[PDB]
Symmetry: C4
Subunit: 312 residues, 4 copies
């Protein structure tokens, strides 16, 4: 059997494989447990699949999942986790930004009785106080969308129990906010604090288009809260628009409002706008219902059973 | 085999387990049938799981379903019923607000030939007029929503035959209105009147946000009637607007209306509003069809078969 | 092996069972083939079930499908079709409105090489002008909806081969229009003309709610053509508003408009209406895509195979 | 084991069976590989099926898939590919517009390692400049929507390896734009240039309705990019409308200048339009998420594996 699985999504990672595998060998041999390394080649346009083949031939603990195309880090991680067989699964980057030694600490927490063990940075320490603030506000927003309070500063480096992996695969989903989904599958969760290596500091171009795309997926692909905040703002600006339209009709009828000579335009505008806003609100509520239905999340998740066998 | 399955959703229920189990045993032993008790620990932060494990170790009829986190009473009950194997499932509350002595009565009615035996309070006896009038109107609205007339004053205390349990498990809906769903499975149903124990009161704080969210969920996640009343009234409004626009157009050509000099903003407003209202109505009708399809409700439900074997 | 299945939906059909079964046996005995009679009791409040059980005890060819609730004649017919194992299934009415003797003719047509053999009335007879006009208009609409030209004056009385029954069972859509579904799955189809009995030619009641809902289902639950005639008429209007909004912009920036200075109100009205109509068109197009995706109809329907085995 | 499958969709293709079936055997037999011809009779209202059955009796390699009605070229190709068991599936047209000798070249490129070998026309040639420009613009628009740039001037003549065929069958879409699906699943693709048959160029009168429907299927049934682009565009228009409404409120409050005395109409119009556009944008974003969920494409596609077995 396999106790630990290390999932490494790789995309154009030559000359990083030797160092990464040396570090993983330094880390995983003291553990004295059976492990495996699932390398997800995410359709690289670079001579790295050949080096992965060379490493796999000599080393019996390397398994390779070669994706047909380039799907992205999250999808490659999902593929590796689907193909992982260990009792615990640890996603790890191929650039060694997250130190592999923390695996041991993570594994220790896994033996303490926890199911998901996140690996959180002590602090950002390299962002220009704009990314820190935006991340803090966004994380408060999603935490108010969630009900598990996913720890801040958590990346993809973590440890999953087999129960959590099975629960994640139990969620049939195509638009997945992975942090929100992890919060949704609420098992015994914890985190361990680690400091990223000082060389690995702020050097990435935080292109705000993909950051905004990630924000939109987090806001919309996870929860209906942005859809329920609207259609509640709407039908308030619609009930308040049908009002002051009935009020306008009453004022015109009683006072005899013909100061312009044309006051039915405002009444028509307000009435049609309010009716259309109510229609859009009803459509939004039923679209949220359809979204919940098509997400097809399980009603519940059983963590343990005493005296009962697991339902298939 | 198991004849009866008592499903108790439990959340922070320590110091209530001893009394509840004593009453359950005192009620179930005279029945002289092979019963089972399934306790669904709904992610309690309290120390009830240890006591549940101890009682499962002592009593062999106790079974524990440990949900990953807190999913709510409804989802905990669904999880317990899914794991219930008895010929009749009785959902009960661990607070003993529903007297377990009624179970015998329910079973008696279940042996009379009925499939669903609800437990209904005779009178509210403790709730003010603001929680009686609203309840009454909500029940009339729901009764007009369905075609089976769910008896009023009904809680989760009930008896469900294995036929009804399998019928309910055949609904894969994620947005569930339990009262409407149980009305929808139109088996042979009846009620048993009982008086709630005067130990607890009806002055419980009404979190009207919750009593509005649940009401709107039952209204919106059960039937399409709110979406059918609109896109009908809305389409009627659109037809009236277009008729008024045509009449105004005529009154502009014949009779030569030029008194304001701009009696065409009204025409454009009315025409565009009517066109958008028809578009919204068509979108709403098709969204309703999409919702009915994604709910994936079975077309029919076979109660009994003579000369035939049940389809897979 | 069963050669013929006769599916009879029943609802308060007591006192017709004796005559119906007598006529059915008189018709079916000369055919000299094995047959079954599936009586689908649609949750009748009458004593129909007792007589059905007695007949099933007396006659071995009678099977009963007792639906739990009153689902409707269409859903009862569906429940009968799924539970019918004959090589050719004939839906018929328990009131003997359609003469059972036509079974013989249908069988001959089925043995000529046809897959669906409709039973069409020669004329409406009873109804004179209004019902015929409305039916002709509706049938023209639904004929332009599909591409297989279902014969007119058709009811639920027909013969369907096992191939057609399986093809229909390959459509797991809850919002179903059977008159259109039997055309969409088009096989070798034909019809036979039958003259309804003089008994069943009296004045008929037509509540314009069941008929109205039938028309709405035939319009919106069959295809996207009602949604595709709009999103074009709603988009031509949007284009014709954005144009002439540009024309008013030009007629204001050239030939400086001091004629009611508070013009360009119409520019805003037209521009916002056109943008909203383009939005409504885009949402309508994608909603139709979602609708036909959710319906999950098979892409094709193989009728015969030479040199190949049928796909599982 | 069949090393090559030739799928031929057919509709009213008589007087073309002998020529096609002579050229196909003139081409395939020199390859000395076990081939298989699968003729999908797409509901021809013609004697095509009888001659196909004659050829099926005559030759052991021709198999027939008969569809219940006329479904179209793409659906017939899907049916033929689903019934093809060869290691490489080569769709082909029965009118022989694309030379069958190119199959040899295709097979060579299949032996060279490539998974999808497109057969692309060298140039459109005969058709006019405006048609070529429209096709080029459409392909340029699609290229951004895709992930791997599909070769220009592609058709239904191609070679798909068994890997790619299994990947495409894994896509349970009902709204399939195949030219985009073959780029989404993108394996090791390549293309082979060829010229269409002489005298078979300048006789195609384009069906503007059919071309429009195909283009709209490509735009709307493949990607959400048009939806997201228009949602963004509506968001900018809504923000501009709200900002201009606020500016008008200022100008009518600050500076106190109300010139007409009836300019609240524009504020109401702008504000209601902006609110409705925000609501429509939210509805569109959630409809796109529902569309992505409903399409149910697999997150990833595995091409090769090392050390692991393929998941079921
Ligand atoms: O399409 C893919 C598929 C897989 N991986 C793998 O993902 C791991 C780490 O991904 P990476 O993007 O390098 O994360 P960081 O090293 O922390 O830096 C990132 O910092 C930003 C935060 O997401 C990203 O936008 C930048 O692309 C990237 O420099 C590595 O093993 C990669 O091989 C990718 O990066 N892109
Ligand atoms: O999130 C959960 C999960 C499980 N249970 C179980 O449900 C049973 C009883 O449910 P309870 O909520 O106490 O029923 P009520 O007696 O009707 O009291 C509640 O009824 C209201 C309507 O739900 C609630 O809003 C209030 O918390 C409370 O007054 C108990 O075994 C609990 O353990 C809960 O109550 N809440
Ligand atoms: O809810 C149900 C369930 C089953 N059946 C069975 O369906 C069979 C035939 O139905 P029936 O209503 O008797 O046929 P019609 O004589 O055509 O009655 C119709 O006559 C009108 C036009 O002729 C229609 O518009 C109405 O739907 C309906 O009243 C009968 O054996 C019934 O038992 C019903 O009628 N209603
Ligand atoms: O309903 C059907 C079913 C099957 N096939 C088969 O599809 C193959 C190729 O189709 P075909 O019509 O012969 O292609 P073209 O001769 O190129 O004609 C097309 O030329 C344009 C460029 O593709 C298209 O836009 C037009 O729709 C169409 O007239 C043929 O073997 C047919 O048998 C059809 O054409 N129509
Ligand atoms: Mg309680
Ligand atoms: Mg009748
Ligand atoms: Mg041609």
């Amino acid at each position: 059997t396999i106790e630990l699985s290390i999932v490494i999504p790789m995309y154009n990672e030559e000359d990083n494989l030797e160092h990464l595998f040396a570090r993983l060998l330094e880390v995983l041999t003291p553990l004295k447990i059976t492990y495996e390394i699932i390398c997800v080649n995410d359709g690289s346009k670079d001579k790295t699949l050949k080096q992965l083949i060379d490493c796999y031939q000599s080393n019996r603990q390397i398994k390779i999942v070669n994706l047909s195309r380039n799907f992205g880090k999250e999808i490659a991680l999902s593929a590796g986790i689907d193909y992982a067989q260990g009792n615990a699964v640890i996603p790890i980057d191929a650039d060694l930004q997250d130190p592999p030694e923390l695996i041991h600490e993570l594994v220790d927490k896994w033996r303490e009785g926890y199911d998901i063990v996140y690996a959180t940075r002590r602090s950002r320490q390299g962002e220009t106080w704009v990314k820190q603030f935006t991340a803090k506000m966004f994380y408060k927003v999603i935490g108010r969308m969630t009900e598990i309070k996913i720890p801040p500063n958590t990346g993809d480096f973590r440890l999953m129990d087999r129960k959590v992996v099975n629960a994640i695969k139990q969620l049939p989903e195509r638009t997945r906010f992975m942090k929100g989904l992890f919060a949704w599958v609420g098992y015994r969760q914890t985190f361990v604090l680690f400091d990223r290596e000082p060389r690995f500091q702020g050097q990435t171009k935080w292109n705000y288009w993909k950051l905004w795309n990630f924000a939109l997926d987090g806001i919309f692909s996870f929860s209906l809260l942005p859809l329920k905040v609207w259609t509640y703002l709407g039908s308030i600006i619609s009930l308040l628009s049908l009002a002051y339209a009935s009020f306008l009709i009453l004022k015109t009828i009683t006072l005899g409002v013909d100061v312009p000579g044309y006051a039915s335009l405002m009444v028509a505008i307000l009435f049609l706008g309010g009716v259309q806003l109510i229609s859009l609100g009803v459509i939004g509520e039923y679209l949220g219902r359809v979204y919940e239905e098509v997400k097809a999340r399980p009603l519940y998740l059983v963590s343990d059973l005493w005296g009962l066998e697991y339902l298939p």
